[PDB]
Design an enzyme around this catalytic site. Structure first.
Site, PDB file in Angstrom:
ATOM      1  N   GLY A  29       2.494  -3.362 -10.010  1.00 34.04           N
ATOM      2  CA  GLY A  29       1.427  -2.368  -9.876  1.00 34.04           C
ATOM      3  C   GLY A  29       0.581  -2.340 -11.137  1.00 34.04           C
ATOM      4  O   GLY A  29      -0.378  -3.108 -11.254  1.00 34.04           O
ATOM      5  N   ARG A  30       0.979  -1.488 -12.085  1.00 36.55           N
ATOM      6  CA  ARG A  30       0.188  -1.176 -13.284  1.00 36.55           C
ATOM      7  C   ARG A  30      -0.043  -2.362 -14.217  1.00 36.55           C
ATOM      8  O   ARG A  30      -1.106  -2.441 -14.827  1.00 36.55           O
ATOM      9  CB  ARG A  30       0.752   0.036 -14.037  1.00 36.55           C
ATOM     10  CG  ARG A  30       0.542   1.365 -13.324  1.00 36.55           C
ATOM     11  CD  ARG A  30       1.486   2.499 -13.796  1.00 36.55           C
ATOM     12  NE  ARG A  30       2.842   2.372 -13.252  1.00 36.55           N
ATOM     13  CZ  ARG A  30       3.865   3.178 -13.534  1.00 36.55           C
ATOM     14  NH1 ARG A  30       3.743   4.194 -14.388  1.00 36.55           N
ATOM     15  NH2 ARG A  30       5.038   2.969 -12.958  1.00 36.55           N
ATOM     16  N   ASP A  70      14.313   9.391   7.092  1.00 34.81           N
ATOM     17  CA  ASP A  70      14.694  10.500   7.965  1.00 34.81           C
ATOM     18  C   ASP A  70      15.567  10.016   9.122  1.00 34.81           C
ATOM     19  O   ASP A  70      15.856   8.824   9.265  1.00 34.81           O
ATOM     20  CB  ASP A  70      13.423  11.159   8.527  1.00 34.81           C
ATOM     21  CG  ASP A  70      13.492  12.671   8.534  1.00 34.81           C
ATOM     22  OD1 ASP A  70      14.536  13.223   8.934  1.00 34.81           O
ATOM     23  OD2 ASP A  70      12.495  13.330   8.136  1.00 34.81           O
ATOM     24  N   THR A  76      12.785  11.192  14.153  1.00 36.40           N
ATOM     25  CA  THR A  76      11.651  11.540  13.298  1.00 36.40           C
ATOM     26  C   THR A  76      10.861  10.327  12.821  1.00 36.40           C
ATOM     27  O   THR A  76       9.620  10.276  12.955  1.00 36.40           O
ATOM     28  CB  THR A  76      12.120  12.386  12.085  1.00 36.40           C
ATOM     29  OG1 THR A  76      12.641  13.624  12.571  1.00 36.40           O
ATOM     30  CG2 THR A  76      10.993  12.663  11.096  1.00 36.40           C
ATOM     31  N   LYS A  85       8.743   4.065   2.675  1.00 37.91           N
ATOM     32  CA  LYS A  85      10.117   4.521   2.459  1.00 37.91           C
ATOM     33  C   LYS A  85      10.620   5.533   3.496  1.00 37.91           C
ATOM     34  O   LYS A  85      11.044   6.631   3.153  1.00 37.91           O
ATOM     35  CB  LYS A  85      10.277   5.035   1.022  1.00 37.91           C
ATOM     36  CG  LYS A  85       9.889   3.999  -0.041  1.00 37.91           C
ATOM     37  CD  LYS A  85      10.256   4.466  -1.460  1.00 37.91           C
ATOM     38  CE  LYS A  85      10.297   3.289  -2.437  1.00 37.91           C
ATOM     39  NZ  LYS A  85       8.872   2.772  -2.563  1.00 37.91           N
ATOM     40  N   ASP A 127       4.312   0.845   1.963  1.00 36.33           N
ATOM     41  CA  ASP A 127       5.485   1.299   1.229  1.00 36.33           C
ATOM     42  C   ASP A 127       5.767   2.748   1.565  1.00 36.33           C
ATOM     43  O   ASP A 127       5.536   3.640   0.749  1.00 36.33           O
ATOM     44  CB  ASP A 127       5.234   1.188  -0.267  1.00 36.33           C
ATOM     45  CG  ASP A 127       6.525   1.304  -1.082  1.00 36.33           C
ATOM     46  OD1 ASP A 127       7.584   1.589  -0.484  1.00 36.33           O
ATOM     47  OD2 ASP A 127       6.468   1.132  -2.320  1.00 36.33           O
ATOM     48  N   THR A 187       0.817  -1.196   0.000  1.00 39.92           N
ATOM     49  CA  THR A 187       0.000   0.000   0.000  1.00 39.92           C
ATOM     50  C   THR A 187       0.861   1.260   0.000  1.00 39.92           C
ATOM     51  O   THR A 187       1.975   1.283   0.542  1.00 39.92           O
ATOM     52  CB  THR A 187      -0.879   0.111   1.285  1.00 39.92           C
ATOM     53  OG1 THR A 187      -0.061  -0.076   2.455  1.00 39.92           O
ATOM     54  CG2 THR A 187      -2.003  -0.878   1.302  1.00 39.92           C
TER      55      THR A 187
END
Ligand SMILES: O=c1cc(O)n([C@@H]2O[C@H](COP(=O)(O)O)[C@@H](O)[C@H]2O)c(=O)[nH]1
Ligand SMILES: O=c1cc(O)n([C@@H]2O[C@H](COP(=O)(O)O)[C@@H](O)[C@H]2O)c(=O)[nH]1
Lengths: 257, 257
Positions: free
Chosen positions: B228-229, B95, B99, B92, B90, B60
């Site tokens: 995905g696509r 930082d 954080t 990613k 997802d 997601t």
């Protein structure tokens, strides 16, 4: 030879967002970016209102905000206009172009509708900038590329850093500068913002490393300091903000003449 | 010599999340991760329900979801349990430790309350993993490190990649594998997930590059494909999912014996 922020604001190649930023910096005698690292909307807004006169920029992590709504962002924009600072959403986009463009424009946050500036990691390659620019250019927004990090074991060094600079030069219509620990580019049209800043030596338990405003602005050639806990964790955040503003400003003036 | 997913699931050093993943893969004969890259909660849920039997994982981007609420995530978890797949947000993270731990636990998304797995970039250095683990370990969650990217001009190569692997070995209590284009680690306790996958040659306009399941699983040594696509953009997403499942599964079986 170094140019004042007022003069940099008028440079032929300057981005409109950088220009606005450079002029309010000069006007207000501040090169301080507040990192408003808080989880309550009321504290964010009380900080932006109280500290607004002392700062050139307010940097947000909207995904920490327990009670985010777009109306909170409306209120923050009102404060930003009243007190004259930019709003910088520290989202660190770091995906493929096709993904980041949706992250930037859509979802609950609608980042691009309220953020003057966002930032991105250069690791995915230049498609991360191309993707953001398809949303950002129509909205007249700018982007900072993360060329260096403050944290222990950072991989943003050497050729990685050189690559962030190249990416910046080649997307100058949207990229307005860098998050770095030092000046990485000789071109005065780019801003350098530096986090990892505190008056006292130290760090945290999770890899953060601090340097002083005088080291960062004065010795390392940066333009703006980003400061979170140095201010937010103080009892009097206004006084703390003022102490950071005056250190960064004087470091700037001393480097200039 | 290569081990089946069922055997890898029982390895002495295996992470509990990887083990669960490896067993349902073997059970269901799927090594396909759907990248559900959609902006409507109803489409996400209809895809998860219809494709749930064909997939080992649902990936997601919750920050694209126009109508996200935690209840949508409750519904997705119900589907994940019913059909037996993991949920991978997802995000990613990229930082500093201090954080990322707030980004992971808090804000509107409360990622850690519903995501079996998240991922992180290794650029900030090892504090990004330390920060996530302070939320993730108590919640029994796992993390993937991005060692390589599919996109044109990716900087995740050479020593950067070697560094992601090291970071993984040294946080094996929380890190369960990699997002990479190929096998990067020889240790069978780590999963390799590969995006940038399509049946046909090609790419997109924003730097994405495609390779086939046979190239990725069969030649390059990866374990799981993220698509995905290739599926979402097809008319019959069930049939597309099945065509990806069967390609990745057979590529796996052929590499094995
Ligand atoms: O290299 C970097 C890049 C960052 O954006 N930051 C960000 O800047 C702020 C630093 O905060 P503090 O002053 O509390 O350590 C944090 O919001 C962090 O996410 C950083 O610390 N180092
Ligand atoms: O190197 C990488 C790492 C990723 O996570 N991804 C992600 O995987 C998916 C690829 O989608 P698609 O199959 O539509 O190109 C996207 O969600 C993207 O954010 C990727 O494409 N390449």
């Amino acid at each position: 030879k170094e140019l004042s922020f007022g003069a940099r604001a008028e440079l032929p190649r300057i981005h409109p967002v950088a220009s606005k930023l450079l002029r309010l910096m000069q006007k207000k005698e501040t090169n301080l970016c507040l990192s408003a690292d808080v989880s309550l909307a009321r504290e964010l807004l009380q900080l932006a209102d109280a500290l607004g006169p002392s700062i050139c920029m307010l940097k947000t992590h909207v995904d920490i905000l327990n009670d985010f709504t777009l109306d909170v962002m409306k209120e923050l924009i009102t404060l930003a206009k009243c007190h004259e600072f930019l709003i910088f959403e520290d989202r660190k986009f770091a995906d493929i172009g096709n993904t980041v463009k949706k992250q930037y424009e859509g979802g609950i946050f609608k980042i691009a509708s309220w953020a003057d500036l966002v930032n991105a990691h250069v690791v995915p390659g230049s498609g991360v900038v191309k993707g953001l620019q398809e949303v950002g250019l129509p909205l007249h927004r700018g982007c900072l590329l993360i060329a260096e990090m403050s944290s222990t074991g950072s991989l943003a060094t050497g050729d990685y850093t050189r690559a962030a600079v190249r990416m910046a030069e080649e997307h100058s219509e949207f990229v307005v500068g860098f998050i770095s620990g030092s000046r990485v580019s000789m071109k005065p049209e780019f801003l350098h913002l530096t986090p990892g800043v505190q008056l006292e030596a130290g760090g945290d338990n999770l890899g953060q490393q601090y340097n002083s405003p005088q080291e960062v602005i004065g010795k390392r050639g940066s333009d703006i300091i980003i400061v979170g806990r140095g201010i937010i964790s103080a009892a009097d955040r206004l006084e703390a903000a003022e102490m950071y503003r005056k250190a960064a400003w004087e470091a700037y003036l001393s480097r200039l003449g």
